[PDB]
Ligand binder design. Structure first.
Ligand SMILES: *Cc1c(COP(=O)(O)O)cnc(C)c1O
Ligand SMILES: *Cc1c(COP(=O)(O)O)cnc(C)c1O
Lengths: 394, 393
């Protein structure tokens, strides 16, 4: 095959770390920057440079709200999903603290949630970190058992960024609503990938980013429910912008880019995620019959774009080196993935795990190249430990 | 020319096309779009290189080590981080903070939040010209004072504080000194290897770089420390977690590179225009300069006009994109200088920049002269002005 043979290397399989900006998004962004464009500050209320800028912000705010079934007034712009996570959890925790100081989250949450919760523990909040099941799913009966009268907040993400597992955010939402608990979802990896309708879903706070959906880095949003009303304390002060919730200049060009990505995503999501899901199954089929490999997560109920695989009887660092033709991630920090460790894998298996994440430039030929490279590489490397021979005995 | 004339560069500036050109290379599939935290592949390594180059360009303008530069989302974030970060870090030493009534709201609203948290804040009144009396700063400084925040250039009236002298007083007493340099960076010279400032805020969009990126300088010698306000992975050496927006960072870097080359020439040109503007309007009766021309940024002119209504003034000048600093409450900075509410209302900030010409200044002088004349012709207030304006207003 012509594509397969003239294959540009390394192959990008790390869309979960960041995505390339869609050419249409970039083109929109370019009109909101120079003296010839709409470069005004939306907060300049006294002249047309400002009004024009405010208008482009309101369009983008509607574009974002339309994807996720919210009212634009529920969308608070932030500098990214890290900030959204900080704002949601510290904002709600501080606002509702006289009602209770107990927070429940998952051990497999992104660090923006975990380190936030750890900071709140310093401040006197008490935090339950729930252990997931081996597949990454939180046991909903364990969640209910942890819920108390002084529980103010639960934070559990839609799609796990390391392993792609999908939590039942609707059921968790129902549990929280019935008890009067604020439910925050980190939807950074699910927005524009799985359907989200906040007019139906019982979620109070939701974090999104631009750069996991072909928008620019350094912009995000937090959805803050108007009905039934949830409040949060601003963490960023300076003029009470975004209805008191987040002060600072609105980076119009960034906001316009995010809105455009979310407009694109609503239109192209269903065809593209079907295509991606086909490609992920194609990848897993090719590699599942290598002996002693393990899928981390859920094949049928996972995100269409993430495949996290553990390879037994090989050494983690030489694995990444063997796969240098691919841009991938092991989740290493050398600490292995705290997420894999939470599922209960030993450190060495956790080290020799690879997240493959797919996106809109990913082809069938890249997948086939990947399959043959993984197969070759695992065979070659296992020929280097006696443990593999000492597996092929007992 | 083109109407309306942009004279609101202090609100935001247009991105320099050199800056935009660089940013465009760090975005799409055929450019450098990777995440610099992606440590295991070249998409990350090449993004990390661009960030390091940008960080070096920023540090070079201001006389710092790049390791002292912490990236943030803007000067609002840098201000919040510096003050809350230093106040929380040093709170066992004391809980007293001194700032100025005329600071940006990013400082003032931050200090008000810290008051809720049990900190004590002194807000110093400036002099009628906007300058802080250093004798009153000194009088306010105690054994339990941990932090002072006094901006370099005021965004509303352009007044320049003696940040070097303030820095000396703070260092001599073991007090942390934070400077909001959002309006001075790329306009006045800053050399942090000489200047005794511990924390310094800057932005990209006040010097022809993109909105939504900024930095905080955090001194490493003698070492200053702050508590992170943004958690999630301990990035920027623990001080600010989150993904590094590489195209934004590259734009800011490039804006700061350009500013180092072009600053001296451009600020001389702007000071000329600022002076040209003031000369043309100073011989209108009953107008007041807010600030101090001698201790004032080269690109800002803030003027109050007596005997006109503020709302009518700004509409009369619709040929200009300017600011009156209203919110309708008048400018809190002007109220802090001592002006009555009406005079504060009928004040205009003219801020100049890269595209401002002598033709635009001349048009502005004429427009202003004619407009004030017209306005004072309505209402017998101006007509009375003669009759012995009956006391107190
Ligand atoms: C990427 C990621 C974040 C951080 O997002 P930024 O916009 O880069 O700060 C938070 N949560 C999840 C699930 C993520 O994948
Ligand atoms: C504009 C400005 C800010 C706010 O900076 P952003 O980058 O827009 O958040 C803070 N301080 C001063 C003096 C400013 O003029």
């Amino acid at each position: 095959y012509g594509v397969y043979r003239a294959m540009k290397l390394p192959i990008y399989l790390d869309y979960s770390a960041t995505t390339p900006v869609d050419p249409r998004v970039a083109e929109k962004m370019m009109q909101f920057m120079t003296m010839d464009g709409t470069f005004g500050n939306p907060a300049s209320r006294s002249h047309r440079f400002g009004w024009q800028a405010e208008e482009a912000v309101d369009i983008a705010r509607n574009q974002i709200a339309d994807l996720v079934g919210a009212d634009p007034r529920e969308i608070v712009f932030t500098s990214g999903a890290t900030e959204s996570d900080n704002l949601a959890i510290k904002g709600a925790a501080n606002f509702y603290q006289k009602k209770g100081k107990h927070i429940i989250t998952s051990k497999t949450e992104h660090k923006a949630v975990l380190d936030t919760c750890r900071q709140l523990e310093r401040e006197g909040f008490e935090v339950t970190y729930l252990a997931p099941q081996r597949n990454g799913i939180i046991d909903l009966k364990e969640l209910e058992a942890a819920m108390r009268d002084d529980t103010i907040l639960v934070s559990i993400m839609h799609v796990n960024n390391e392993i792609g597992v999908v939590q039942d955010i609707a059921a968790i939402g129902e549990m929280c609503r019935a008890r009067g608990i604020i439910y925050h979802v980190d939807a950074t990896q699910s927005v524009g990938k799985l359907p989200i309708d906040l007019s139906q879903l019982k979620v109070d706070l939701m974090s999104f980013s631009g750069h996991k959906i072909y928008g620019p880095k350094g912009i995000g949003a937090l959805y803050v429910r108007r009905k039934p009303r949830v409040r949060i304390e601003a963490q960023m002060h300076g003029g009470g912008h975004e209805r008191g919730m987040r002060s600072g200049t609105l980076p119009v060009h960034q906001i316009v880019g995010m809105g455009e990505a979310y407009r694109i995503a609503k239109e192209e999501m269903a065809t593209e995620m079907e295509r991606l899901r086909g490609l992920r199954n194609r990848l897993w089929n090719g590699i599942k019959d290598i002996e002693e490999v393990y899928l981390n997560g859920d094949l049928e109920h996972g995100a269409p774009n993430i495949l996290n695989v553990s390879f037994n009887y090989v050494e983690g660092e030489s694995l990444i080196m063997a796969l240098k033709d691919l841009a991938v991630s092991s989740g290493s920090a050398l600490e292995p993935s705290y997420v894999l460790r939470a599922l209960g894998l030993n450190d060495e298996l956790a080290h020799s795990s690879i997240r493959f994440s797919l996106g809109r430039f990913t082809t069938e030929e890249e997948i086939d190249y990947t399959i043959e490279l993984v197969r070759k590489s695992i065979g070659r490397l296992r020929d280097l430990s006696p443990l593999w021979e000492m597996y092929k005995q007992g």
